[PDB]
Amino acid sequence: GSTNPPPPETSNPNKPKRQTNQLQYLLRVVLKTLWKHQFAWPFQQPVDAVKLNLPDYYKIIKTPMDMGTIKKRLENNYYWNAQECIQDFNTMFTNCYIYNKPGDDIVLMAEALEKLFLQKINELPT
Ligand SMILES: Cc1nnc2n1-c1ccc(-c3ccc(N)nc3)cc1N(c1ccc(Cl)cc1)C[C@@H]2C
């Protein structure tokens, strides 16, 4: 049998909280732009491998990540360093490349989201 894992942790009241220009930009600008993109929908929540009848997804992907979880981490002040968020976006993209194969439709879609991501963080405030 196959059960999805629990989503990644998103909120923990023991972790200290800080508001930074970079974390606010990642929420208010970057996540916003990726979220309306044409290709955002597969990435807006955890991959539901039970629904999709994919029992190997979580055999292959051991560090799940998605924009819904990133949104939550940002808005719940889970991240301390901006690079924690940028690492979660890279995990999301790379999970797609790992599970799938070069040139697959969803890989082309992830590649385009990644290109938008990189253009947006080029303008990360200091
Ligand atoms: C992210 C990610 N990384 N690999 C996958 N995905 C993926 C995640 C969710 C879904 C999906 C599929 C149907 C639905 N109703 N909601 C979400 C499809 C995906 N994939 C997908 C395949 C083709 C296209 Cl055009 C879009 C998404 C395939 C595969 C499971």
Swiss-Prot record:
There is a cross-link at residue 59 (Glycyl lysine isopeptide (Lys-Gly) (interchain with G-Cter in SUMO2)). Changing residue 100 to A: Abolishes binding to acetylated histones. Ubiquitously expressed. It is found in: Nucleus; Chromosome. Belongs to the BET family. Interacts with p53/TP53; the interaction is direct. Interacts (via CTD region) with CDK9 and CCNT1, acting as an associated component of P-TEFb complex. Interacts with RELA (when acetylated at 'Lys-310'). Interacts (via NET domain) with NSD3, CHD4, BICRA and ATAD5. The interaction with BICRA bridges BRD4 to the GBAF complex. Interacts (via NET domain) with JMJD6 (via JmjC and N-terminal domains); the interaction is stronger in presence of ssRNA and recruits JMJD6 on distal enhancers. Interacts with NSD3. Interacts with NIPBL. JQ1, a thieno-triazolo-1,4-diazepine derivative, and I-BET, a benzodiazepine derivative, have been tested on tumors with success. Treatment with GSK1210151A (I-BET151, a I-BET derivative) has strong effets on mixed lineage leukemia and promotes myeloid differentiation and leukemia stem-cell depletion. It is linked to Cornelia de Lange syndrome 6: A form of Cornelia de Lange syndrome, a clinically heterogeneous developmental disorder associated with malformations affecting multiple systems. It is characterized by facial dysmorphisms, abnormal hands and feet, growth delay, cognitive retardation, hirsutism, gastroesophageal dysfunction and cardiac, ophthalmologic and genitourinary anomalies. CDLS6 inheritance is autosomal dominant. This is Bromodomain-containing protein 4. The lineage of its organism: Eukaryota, Metazoa, Chordata, Craniata, Vertebrata.
